[PDB]
Short mmCIF file of C-alpha atoms and ligand atoms in Angstrom, two decimals:
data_model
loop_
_atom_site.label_atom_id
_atom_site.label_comp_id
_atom_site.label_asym_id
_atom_site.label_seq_id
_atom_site.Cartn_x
_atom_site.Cartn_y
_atom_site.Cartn_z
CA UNK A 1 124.35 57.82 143.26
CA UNK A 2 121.23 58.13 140.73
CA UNK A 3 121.44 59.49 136.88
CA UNK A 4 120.23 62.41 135.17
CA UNK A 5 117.47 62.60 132.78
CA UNK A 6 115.41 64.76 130.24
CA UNK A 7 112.53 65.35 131.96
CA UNK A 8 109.14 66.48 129.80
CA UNK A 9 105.74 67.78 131.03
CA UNK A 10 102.84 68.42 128.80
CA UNK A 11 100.33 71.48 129.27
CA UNK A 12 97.38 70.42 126.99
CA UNK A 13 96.30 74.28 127.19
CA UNK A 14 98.86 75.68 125.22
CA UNK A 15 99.71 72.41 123.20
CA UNK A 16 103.00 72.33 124.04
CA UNK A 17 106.04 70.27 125.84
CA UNK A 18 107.87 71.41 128.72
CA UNK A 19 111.46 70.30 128.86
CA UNK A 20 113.50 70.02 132.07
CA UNK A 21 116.28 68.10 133.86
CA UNK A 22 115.96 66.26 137.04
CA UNK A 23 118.39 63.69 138.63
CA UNK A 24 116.42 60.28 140.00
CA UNK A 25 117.47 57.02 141.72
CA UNK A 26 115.11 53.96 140.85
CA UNK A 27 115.45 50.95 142.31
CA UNK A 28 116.69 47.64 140.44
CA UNK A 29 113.54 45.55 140.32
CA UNK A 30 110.33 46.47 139.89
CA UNK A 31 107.61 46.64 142.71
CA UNK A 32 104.46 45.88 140.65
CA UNK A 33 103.26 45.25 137.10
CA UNK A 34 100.31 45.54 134.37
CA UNK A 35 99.60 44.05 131.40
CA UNK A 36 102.17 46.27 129.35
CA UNK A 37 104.59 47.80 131.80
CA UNK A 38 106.26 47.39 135.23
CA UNK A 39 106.47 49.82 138.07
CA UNK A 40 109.41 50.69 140.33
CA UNK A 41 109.71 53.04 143.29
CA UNK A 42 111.74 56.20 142.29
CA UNK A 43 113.39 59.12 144.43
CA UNK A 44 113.87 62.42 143.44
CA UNK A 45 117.37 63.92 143.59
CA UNK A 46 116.06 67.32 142.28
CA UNK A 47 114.85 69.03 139.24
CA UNK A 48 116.65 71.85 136.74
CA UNK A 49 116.57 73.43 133.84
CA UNK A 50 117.27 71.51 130.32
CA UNK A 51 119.64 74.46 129.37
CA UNK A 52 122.92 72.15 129.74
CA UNK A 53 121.65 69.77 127.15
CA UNK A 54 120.87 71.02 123.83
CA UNK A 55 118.93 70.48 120.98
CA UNK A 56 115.12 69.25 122.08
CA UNK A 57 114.10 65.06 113.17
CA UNK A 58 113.51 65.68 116.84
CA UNK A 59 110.44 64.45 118.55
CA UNK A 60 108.35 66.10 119.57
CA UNK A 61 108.99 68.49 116.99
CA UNK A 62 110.36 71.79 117.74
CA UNK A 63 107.13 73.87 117.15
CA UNK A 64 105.88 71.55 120.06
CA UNK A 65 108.03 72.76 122.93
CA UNK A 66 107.96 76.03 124.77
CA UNK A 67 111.29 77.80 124.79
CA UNK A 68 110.00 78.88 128.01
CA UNK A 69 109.60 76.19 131.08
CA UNK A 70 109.30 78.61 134.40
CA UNK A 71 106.14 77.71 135.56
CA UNK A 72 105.54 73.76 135.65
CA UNK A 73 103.78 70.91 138.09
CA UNK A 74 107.45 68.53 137.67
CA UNK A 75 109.37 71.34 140.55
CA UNK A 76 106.93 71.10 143.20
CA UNK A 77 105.56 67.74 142.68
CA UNK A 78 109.17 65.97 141.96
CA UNK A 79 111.15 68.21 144.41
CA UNK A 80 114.28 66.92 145.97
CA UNK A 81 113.34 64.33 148.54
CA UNK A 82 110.13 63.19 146.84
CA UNK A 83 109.69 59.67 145.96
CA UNK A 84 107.85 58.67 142.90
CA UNK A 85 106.86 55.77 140.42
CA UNK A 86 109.16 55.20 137.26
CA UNK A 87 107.60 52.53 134.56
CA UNK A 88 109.23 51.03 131.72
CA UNK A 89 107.62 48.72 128.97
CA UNK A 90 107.80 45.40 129.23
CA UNK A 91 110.36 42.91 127.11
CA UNK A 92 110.06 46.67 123.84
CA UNK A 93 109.71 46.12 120.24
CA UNK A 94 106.11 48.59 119.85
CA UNK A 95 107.77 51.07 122.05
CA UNK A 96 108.42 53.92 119.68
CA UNK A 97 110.14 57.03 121.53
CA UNK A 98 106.67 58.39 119.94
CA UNK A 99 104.36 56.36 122.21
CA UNK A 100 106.14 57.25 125.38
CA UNK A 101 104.70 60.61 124.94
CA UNK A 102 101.45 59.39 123.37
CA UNK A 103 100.96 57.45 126.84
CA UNK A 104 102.28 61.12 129.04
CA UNK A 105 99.93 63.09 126.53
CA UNK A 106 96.56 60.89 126.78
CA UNK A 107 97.39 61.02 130.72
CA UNK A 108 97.31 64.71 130.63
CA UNK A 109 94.16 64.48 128.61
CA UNK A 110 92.34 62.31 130.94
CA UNK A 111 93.16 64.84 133.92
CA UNK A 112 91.32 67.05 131.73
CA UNK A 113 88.37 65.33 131.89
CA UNK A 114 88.78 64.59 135.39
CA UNK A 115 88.53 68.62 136.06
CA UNK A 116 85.43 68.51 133.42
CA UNK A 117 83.54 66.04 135.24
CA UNK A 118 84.27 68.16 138.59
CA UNK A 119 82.68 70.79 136.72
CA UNK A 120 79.43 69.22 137.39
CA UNK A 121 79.78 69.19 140.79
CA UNK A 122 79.64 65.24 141.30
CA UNK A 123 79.39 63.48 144.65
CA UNK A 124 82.82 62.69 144.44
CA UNK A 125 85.45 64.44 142.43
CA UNK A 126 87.98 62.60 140.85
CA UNK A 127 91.48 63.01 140.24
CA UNK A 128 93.89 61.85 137.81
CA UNK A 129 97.93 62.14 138.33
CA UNK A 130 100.17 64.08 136.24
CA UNK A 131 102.46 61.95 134.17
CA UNK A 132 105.63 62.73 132.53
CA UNK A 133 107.91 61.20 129.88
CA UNK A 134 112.21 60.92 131.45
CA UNK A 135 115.04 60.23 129.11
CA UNK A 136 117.40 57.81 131.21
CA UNK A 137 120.18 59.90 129.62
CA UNK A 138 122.83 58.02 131.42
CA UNK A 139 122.16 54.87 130.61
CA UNK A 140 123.15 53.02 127.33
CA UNK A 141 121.10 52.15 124.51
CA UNK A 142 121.11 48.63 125.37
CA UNK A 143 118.65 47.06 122.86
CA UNK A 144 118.69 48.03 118.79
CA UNK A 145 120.54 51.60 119.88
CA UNK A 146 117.54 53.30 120.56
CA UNK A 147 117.74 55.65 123.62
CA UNK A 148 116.10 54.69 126.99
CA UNK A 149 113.00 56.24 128.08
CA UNK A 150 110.24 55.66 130.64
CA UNK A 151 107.37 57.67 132.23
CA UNK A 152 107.07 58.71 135.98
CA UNK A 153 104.32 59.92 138.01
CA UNK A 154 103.60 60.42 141.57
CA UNK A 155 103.43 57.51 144.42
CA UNK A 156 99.71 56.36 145.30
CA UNK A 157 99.60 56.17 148.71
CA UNK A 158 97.06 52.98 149.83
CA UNK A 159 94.77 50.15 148.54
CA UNK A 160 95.23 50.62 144.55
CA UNK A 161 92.11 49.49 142.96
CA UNK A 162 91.35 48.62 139.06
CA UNK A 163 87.53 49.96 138.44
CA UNK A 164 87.11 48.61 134.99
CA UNK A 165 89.57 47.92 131.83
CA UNK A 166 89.66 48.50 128.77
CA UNK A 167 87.57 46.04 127.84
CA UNK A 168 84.16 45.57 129.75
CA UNK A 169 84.66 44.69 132.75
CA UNK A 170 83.74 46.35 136.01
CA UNK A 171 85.82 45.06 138.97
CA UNK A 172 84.26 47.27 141.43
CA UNK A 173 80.66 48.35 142.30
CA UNK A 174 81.62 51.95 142.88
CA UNK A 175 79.57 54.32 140.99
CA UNK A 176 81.98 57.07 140.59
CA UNK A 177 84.49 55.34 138.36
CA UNK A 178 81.75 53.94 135.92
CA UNK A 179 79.64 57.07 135.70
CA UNK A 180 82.80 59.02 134.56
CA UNK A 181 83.59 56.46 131.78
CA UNK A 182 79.96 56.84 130.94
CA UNK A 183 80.33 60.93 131.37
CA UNK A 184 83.19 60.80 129.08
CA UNK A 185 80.89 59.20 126.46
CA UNK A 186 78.56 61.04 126.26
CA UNK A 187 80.57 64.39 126.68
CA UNK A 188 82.85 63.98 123.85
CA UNK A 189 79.41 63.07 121.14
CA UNK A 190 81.02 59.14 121.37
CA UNK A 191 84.52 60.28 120.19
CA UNK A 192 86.15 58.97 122.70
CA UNK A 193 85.87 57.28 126.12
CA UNK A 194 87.91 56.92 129.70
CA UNK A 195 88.29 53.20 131.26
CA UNK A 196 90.87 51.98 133.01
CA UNK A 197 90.02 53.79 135.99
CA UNK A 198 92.03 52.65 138.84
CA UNK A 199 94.03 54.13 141.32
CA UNK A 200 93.47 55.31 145.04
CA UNK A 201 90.09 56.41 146.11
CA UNK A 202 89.43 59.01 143.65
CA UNK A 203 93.17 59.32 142.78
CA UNK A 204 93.27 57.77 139.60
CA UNK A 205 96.40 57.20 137.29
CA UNK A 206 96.87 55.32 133.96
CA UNK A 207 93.38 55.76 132.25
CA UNK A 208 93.36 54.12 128.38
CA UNK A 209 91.30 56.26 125.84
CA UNK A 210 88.99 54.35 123.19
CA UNK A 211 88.30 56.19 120.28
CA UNK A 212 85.98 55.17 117.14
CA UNK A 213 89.06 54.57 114.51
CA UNK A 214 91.42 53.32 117.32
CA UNK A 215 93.89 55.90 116.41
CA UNK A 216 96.81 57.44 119.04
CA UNK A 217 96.43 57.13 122.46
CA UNK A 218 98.94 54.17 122.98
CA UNK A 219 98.70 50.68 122.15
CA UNK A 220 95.80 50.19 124.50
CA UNK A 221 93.30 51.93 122.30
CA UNK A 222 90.72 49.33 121.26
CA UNK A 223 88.83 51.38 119.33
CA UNK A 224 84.31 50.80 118.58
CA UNK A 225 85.20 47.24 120.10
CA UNK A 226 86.55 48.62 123.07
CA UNK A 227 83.84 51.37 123.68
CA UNK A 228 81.04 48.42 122.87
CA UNK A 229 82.35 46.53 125.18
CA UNK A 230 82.40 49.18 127.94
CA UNK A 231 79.10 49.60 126.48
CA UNK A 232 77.71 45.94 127.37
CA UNK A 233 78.65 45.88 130.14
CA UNK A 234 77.79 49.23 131.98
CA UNK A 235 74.20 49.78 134.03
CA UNK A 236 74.01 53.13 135.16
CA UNK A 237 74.47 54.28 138.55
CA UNK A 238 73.17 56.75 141.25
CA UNK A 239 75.86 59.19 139.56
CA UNK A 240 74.91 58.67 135.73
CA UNK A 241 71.41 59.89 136.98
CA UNK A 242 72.51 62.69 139.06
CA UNK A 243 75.11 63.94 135.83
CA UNK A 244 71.81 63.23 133.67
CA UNK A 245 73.48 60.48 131.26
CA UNK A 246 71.63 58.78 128.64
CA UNK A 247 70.01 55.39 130.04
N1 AMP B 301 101.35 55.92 140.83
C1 AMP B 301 101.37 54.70 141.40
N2 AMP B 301 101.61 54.52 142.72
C2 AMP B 301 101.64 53.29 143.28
N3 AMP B 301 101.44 52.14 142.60
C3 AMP B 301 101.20 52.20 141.26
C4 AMP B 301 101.15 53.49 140.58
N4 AMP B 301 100.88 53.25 139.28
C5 AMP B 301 100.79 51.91 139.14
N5 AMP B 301 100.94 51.29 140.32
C6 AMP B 301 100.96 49.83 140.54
O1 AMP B 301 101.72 49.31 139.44
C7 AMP B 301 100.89 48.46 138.64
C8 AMP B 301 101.21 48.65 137.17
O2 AMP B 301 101.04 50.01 136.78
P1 AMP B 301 100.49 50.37 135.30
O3 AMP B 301 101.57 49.93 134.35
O4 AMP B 301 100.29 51.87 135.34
O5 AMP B 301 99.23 49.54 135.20
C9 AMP B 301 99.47 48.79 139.05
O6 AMP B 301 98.58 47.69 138.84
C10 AMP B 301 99.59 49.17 140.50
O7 AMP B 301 99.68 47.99 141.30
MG1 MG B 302 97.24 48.48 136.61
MG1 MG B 303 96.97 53.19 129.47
MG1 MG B 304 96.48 53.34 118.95
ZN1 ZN B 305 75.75 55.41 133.12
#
């Protein structure tokens, strides 16, 4: 039958939240896994307007959300019919409802850097998926009382690949997914980088941000040991030299 939830899209270009409705039906067990969270295949039953369900204390704070939500990626790429990915946290106790939509927001931040990189007009553009945080609204709070939440994003259709991790190691010898890390190094003066970098091809989808004092970005943020240990590990590519990286 599926169940409704609060459905909420960032746009990093206005700072705000976007707050919506959409009904889903997830499957029961899970079809895949990382380190923190577990995937399970997801089917859209269509998306709406949050105007039946009021008042989004409050996070994210008022000031955050548009009181306006016409245009937005969730109605075209989570129309009726589509099927997605919905992940939950492992068995949990660090899961604030804040880091849900630390996780959706860093996501949204990595995508972009993704359209920064294409900027330069690399070999291969990259991509990374939107993200967004649902409220299982229908569910019970079957844990301390706190509500349930997840994120979803879109299905990766083919051979998913990790690239690197979050900390030093490079699984692949593709140079796009390394000389982006390293682009996103350099870019941002060493205040911050991109690893993680797995997905499809070029279709990538949860990225993990380092940055120097390990602050935000979600509980995979490893902060100067993480980015030294991208660091040790990375020998620059045909890419780094075409994007003119520091050797
Ligand atoms: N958007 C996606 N489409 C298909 N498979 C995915 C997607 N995201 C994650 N996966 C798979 O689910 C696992 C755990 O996802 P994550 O928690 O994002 O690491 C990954 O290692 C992939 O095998
Ligand atoms: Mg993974
Ligand atoms: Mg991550
Ligand atoms: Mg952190
Ligand atoms: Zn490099």
């Amino acid at each position: 039958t599926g169940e409704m939830g609060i459905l909420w899209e960032f746009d990093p270009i206005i700072n705000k939240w976007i707050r919506l409705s959409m009904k889903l039906k997830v499957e029961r067990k899970p079809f895949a896994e990382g380190a923190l969270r577990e995937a399970y295949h997801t089917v859209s039953l269509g998306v709406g307007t949050d105007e039946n369900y009021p008042l989004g204390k409050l996070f994210p704070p008022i000031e955050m959300i548009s009181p306006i939500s016409k245009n937005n990626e969730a109605m075209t790429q989570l129309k009726n019919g589509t099927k997605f990915v919905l992940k939950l946290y492992k068995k949990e106790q660090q899961a604030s409802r804040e880091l849900y939509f630390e996780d959706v927001k860093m996501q949204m931040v990595c995508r972009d850097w993704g359209n920064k990189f294409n900027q330069k007009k690399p070999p291969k553009k990259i991509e990374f998926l939107m993200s967004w945080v649902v409220e299982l609204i229908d569910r019970s709070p079957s844990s301390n009382g706190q509500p349930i939440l997840c994120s979803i994003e879109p299905l990766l259709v083919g051979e998913f690949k990790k690239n690197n991790s979050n900390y030093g190691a490079v699984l692949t010898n593709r140079s796009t997914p390394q000389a982006f890390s390293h682009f996103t190094y350099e870019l941002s003066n060493k205040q911050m980088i991109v690893v993680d970098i797995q997905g499809v091809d070029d279709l990538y989808t949860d990225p993990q941000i380092h940055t120097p004092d390990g602050k935000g970005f979600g509980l995979g943020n490893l902060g100067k040991a993480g980015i030294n240990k991208f660091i040790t590990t990375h020998k620059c590519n045909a890419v780094c030299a075409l994007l003119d990286l520091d050797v």
